[PDB]
C-alpha cells in the first residue's frame, strides 16, 4: 500500500502522489459521516500528479468522521469549532514540515462539514490558508474575528439543487469579500452531491483567468 493511514500526526492522514512531477499540494477534508478515501477520486480530476494530504477528523460519526461537533442542522459547538481548528491548523504545518510541502503552492480543498473547517481556519488562524475551495458550505462561526483574509483567494460552489444549504451560501460570500478575500463563487444546477461538474469548475478556477 503506497498511502496507508499514517497515525502519528494530530489529525490521521493518508499521503498520495508525493513522487509525482508536481510542487502543487491538495489539502482534502472530506465531508461529515464518511472518511479521507471520498476526495481522492474528485482530487485526481483536479490534479492528477498533485500531492495530496487526505486528511481525517477527529470525531466519529456512524461510519466515518466530521471535523467539530453539530449541535442540530445548521448549528455547530463553538468551542469544538475553536479546538479542531487550531488542532488542524498545528497539523498543516507539522503535516508540511515532514514531507516538504509548500504552502505557498497548497490548496485547502473541502466538502461541507469540511469546507467550513476550511473557511474557519482562514478566519480563526491566519497565514495558513492561501487558496481555498469550499464545495457546499455555509458560514458557521457566530463570532468572526476581524481577521484580515487580504490576498487569499477562495473558491465556492454552491447547488442550485441543494434545497437545505444554498441559502446560506450568499452570505458567506459577503462575509469573505467584507474581509478581503478574493472570492469566486459560483452556482451549478447540482444538488448537495458533488461530483464532476465541480472538479471541471475547481481545475478552470486553478489554471486562472
Avoid at 477534508?29 to 477520486?41: A, K, Q, R
Avoid at 490534479?47 to 471535523?67: H, K, M, N, S, Y
Wanted: aromatic fraction near 6%; glycine fraction near 8%; hydrophobic fraction near 45%.
Amino acid at each position: 500500500e503506497n498511502s496507508p493511514l499514517l497515525t502519528d500526526l494530530a489529525f490521521p492522514y493518508r499521503l498520495l502522489g508525493a513522487g509525482k512531477e508536481s510542487r502543487e499540494c491538495l489539502f482534502l477534508l472530506h465531508g461529515s459521516g464518511v472518511d479521507e478515501t471520498t476526495l481522492v477520486p474528485l482530487a485526481r480530476r483536479i490534479a492528477p500528479t498533485a500531492t495530496l494530504v487526505a486528511a481525517r477528523g477527529r470525531i466519529p460519526q456512524e461510519d466515518g468522521f466530521r471535523w467539530f461537533e453539530r449541535i442540530d442542522p445548521t448549528r455547530f459547538e463553538q468551542k469544538s469549532i475553536l479546538a479542531e481548528t487550531a488542532a488542524f491548523a498545528a497539523f498543516t504545518n507539522e503535516a508540511a514540515k515532514r514531507h516538504g510541502l509548500n504552502l505557498d503552492h497548497a490548496t485547502f480543498l473541502g466538502y461541507s462539514n469540511g469546507a467550513n473547517l476550511v473557511s474557519s481556519l482562514m478566519l480563526l488562524h491566519p497565514g495558513i490558508v492561501r487558496l481555498a475551495a469550499l464545495l457546499r458550505p455555509m458560514p458557521v462561526l457566530d463570532h468572526v474575528p476581524a481577521t484580515d483574509l487580504a490576498g487569499i483567494r477562495t473558491l465556492i460552489i454552491a447547488g442550485a439543487a441543494d434545497e437545505t444549504y444554498g441559502p446560506f451560501v450568499p452570505a458567506l460570500v459577503t462575509l469573505l469579500s467584507r474581509h478581503g478575500a478574493e472570492v469566486d463563487a459560483r452556482i451549478i444546477p447540482s444538488g448537495h452531491d458533488i461530483g464532476d461538474p465541480d472538479a471541471a469548475i475547481v481545475r478552470q478556477w486553478l489554471a486562472g483567468p
